[PDB]
Amino acid sequence: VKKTIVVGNVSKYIPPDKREENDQSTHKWMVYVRGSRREPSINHFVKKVWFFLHPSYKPNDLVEVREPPFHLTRRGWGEFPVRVQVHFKDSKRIDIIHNLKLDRTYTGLQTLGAETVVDVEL
Protein backbone atom coordinates (compact mmCIF):
# COMPACT_ATOMS: atom_id res chain seq x y z
CA VAL A 1 0.00 0.00 0.00
CA LYS A 2 2.05 3.00 1.36
CA LYS A 3 5.66 3.22 -0.03
CA THR A 4 8.45 5.88 0.28
CA ILE A 5 10.36 6.77 -2.95
CA VAL A 6 13.59 8.84 -2.72
CA VAL A 7 15.07 10.46 -5.87
CA GLY A 8 18.55 11.81 -5.00
CA ASN A 9 21.85 12.71 -6.66
CA VAL A 10 25.54 12.48 -5.73
CA SER A 11 28.30 14.25 -7.70
CA LYS A 12 32.09 14.56 -7.73
CA TYR A 13 34.04 17.61 -8.96
CA ILE A 14 36.36 16.74 -11.91
CA PRO A 15 39.66 18.63 -11.35
CA PRO A 16 40.80 20.54 -14.49
CA ASP A 17 43.73 18.12 -15.26
CA LYS A 18 41.38 15.03 -15.16
CA ARG A 19 38.81 16.51 -17.67
CA GLU A 20 38.60 14.84 -21.16
CA GLU A 21 40.01 16.87 -24.13
CA ASN A 22 36.52 17.27 -25.77
CA ASP A 23 34.46 17.52 -22.48
CA GLN A 24 34.37 20.80 -20.42
CA SER A 25 32.03 19.15 -17.79
CA THR A 26 33.07 20.21 -14.21
CA HIS A 27 31.16 17.35 -12.44
CA LYS A 28 30.30 13.64 -12.80
CA TRP A 29 26.79 13.22 -11.24
CA MET A 30 24.60 10.15 -10.51
CA VAL A 31 20.79 10.37 -10.01
CA TYR A 32 19.30 7.43 -8.02
CA VAL A 33 15.79 6.16 -7.21
CA ARG A 34 15.58 4.09 -3.97
CA GLY A 35 13.08 3.29 -1.19
CA SER A 36 13.25 4.28 2.51
CA ARG A 37 16.49 3.93 4.57
CA ARG A 38 14.89 0.74 6.09
CA GLU A 39 13.95 -0.75 2.63
CA PRO A 40 16.24 0.89 0.00
CA SER A 41 15.55 -1.85 -2.67
CA ILE A 42 12.43 -1.00 -4.81
CA ASN A 43 12.88 -3.80 -7.47
CA HIS A 44 9.98 -5.84 -5.92
CA PHE A 45 7.36 -3.08 -6.75
CA VAL A 46 9.15 -0.86 -9.41
CA LYS A 47 9.30 -2.22 -13.03
CA LYS A 48 11.56 0.55 -14.47
CA VAL A 49 12.45 4.30 -14.31
CA TRP A 50 12.66 7.00 -17.06
CA PHE A 51 15.12 9.93 -16.57
CA PHE A 52 14.14 13.09 -18.58
CA LEU A 53 17.35 15.21 -18.94
CA HIS A 54 18.23 18.80 -20.03
CA PRO A 55 18.12 19.37 -23.86
CA SER A 56 22.00 19.61 -23.88
CA TYR A 57 21.98 15.74 -23.44
CA LYS A 58 20.10 15.21 -26.79
CA PRO A 59 19.83 12.87 -28.51
CA ASN A 60 20.20 10.76 -25.26
CA ASP A 61 17.99 13.11 -23.10
CA LEU A 62 15.60 10.21 -22.23
CA VAL A 63 17.29 7.23 -20.43
CA GLU A 64 15.36 4.07 -19.37
CA VAL A 65 16.71 1.82 -16.54
CA ARG A 66 14.79 -1.53 -16.21
CA GLU A 67 17.38 -3.50 -14.10
CA PRO A 68 18.27 -2.40 -10.51
CA PRO A 69 19.92 -0.42 -9.21
CA PHE A 70 17.91 2.51 -10.73
CA HIS A 71 20.95 4.80 -11.30
CA LEU A 72 21.91 7.25 -14.11
CA THR A 73 25.55 8.48 -14.45
CA ARG A 74 26.38 11.58 -16.58
CA ARG A 75 28.99 14.40 -16.74
CA GLY A 76 27.76 18.06 -16.75
CA TRP A 77 28.52 21.69 -15.71
CA GLY A 78 25.00 22.84 -14.63
CA GLU A 79 22.15 22.26 -12.12
CA PHE A 80 18.72 21.54 -13.75
CA PRO A 81 15.43 19.83 -12.77
CA VAL A 82 15.69 16.05 -13.52
CA ARG A 83 12.18 14.64 -14.27
CA VAL A 84 11.98 10.98 -13.06
CA GLN A 85 8.99 8.81 -14.11
CA VAL A 86 8.74 5.59 -11.97
CA HIS A 87 6.78 2.63 -13.49
CA PHE A 88 5.24 0.23 -10.88
CA LYS A 89 4.96 -3.57 -11.53
CA ASP A 90 1.24 -3.94 -10.53
CA SER A 91 -0.25 -0.37 -10.28
CA LYS A 92 0.54 3.06 -12.81
CA ARG A 93 3.25 5.79 -13.19
CA ILE A 94 4.28 8.85 -11.05
CA ASP A 95 6.51 11.84 -12.06
CA ILE A 96 9.10 13.13 -9.50
CA ILE A 97 11.04 16.40 -10.17
CA HIS A 98 14.54 16.32 -8.56
CA ASN A 99 16.57 19.60 -8.60
CA LEU A 100 20.15 18.33 -9.32
CA LYS A 101 22.70 19.69 -6.76
CA LEU A 102 26.44 19.59 -7.71
CA ASP A 103 29.40 19.16 -5.30
CA ARG A 104 30.81 22.37 -3.69
CA THR A 105 33.48 20.57 -1.53
CA TYR A 106 35.69 20.52 -4.71
CA THR A 107 37.59 17.59 -3.03
CA GLY A 108 37.20 15.42 -6.18
CA LEU A 109 35.36 12.90 -3.92
CA GLN A 110 31.70 11.89 -4.49
CA THR A 111 29.33 13.83 -2.12
CA LEU A 112 25.53 13.74 -1.50
CA GLY A 113 23.90 16.60 -3.49
CA ALA A 114 20.23 16.39 -2.38
CA GLU A 115 17.30 13.93 -1.94
CA THR A 116 13.62 14.42 -2.96
CA VAL A 117 11.31 12.26 -0.74
CA VAL A 118 7.75 11.33 -1.94
CA ASP A 119 5.11 9.01 -0.34
CA VAL A 120 3.14 7.04 -3.04
CA GLU A 121 -0.31 5.49 -2.26
CA LEU A 122 -0.46 2.55 -4.81
Residue numbers in the entry: 206 to 296, 299 to 329
Direct quotes from the study:
Acetylated lysine (Kac) in the N-terminal tail of H3 or H4 provides a binding scaffold for reader proteins such as those containing a bromodomain or Yaf9, ENL, AF9, Taf14, and Sas5 (YEATS) domain. Another Kac-binding domain, the YEATS domain, consists of approximately 130 residues and forms an antiparallel β-sheet structure that can recognize and bind Kac and some acylated lysines. In humans, four YEATS domains are present in four different proteins (AF9, ENL, YEATS2, and GAS41).
The ability of YEATS domains to bind the NCP and nucleosome-free dsDNA is assumed to be regulated by their electrostatic surface potentials. On the electrostatic potential maps, AF9-YEATS had no apparent positively charged surface region near the Kac-binding site, whereas YEATS2-YEATS had several positively charged residues, such as K217, K233, and R280; these positively charged residues may interact with dsDNA and thus enhance the dsDNA-binding ability of YEATS2-YEATS. The affinity ratio of YEATS2-YEATS toward the unmodified NCP versus 147-bp dsDNA was small (3.2). Hence, although we cannot exclude the interaction between YEATS2-YEATS and H3K27ac at the peptide level, our NCP-based binding assay revealed that YEATS2-YEATS did not prefer any of the examined H3/H4 acetylations. Our analyses suggest that the YEATS domain of AF9 binds the NCP mainly through DNA and histones, that of YEATS2 binds mainly through DNA, and that of GAS41 binds mainly through histones.
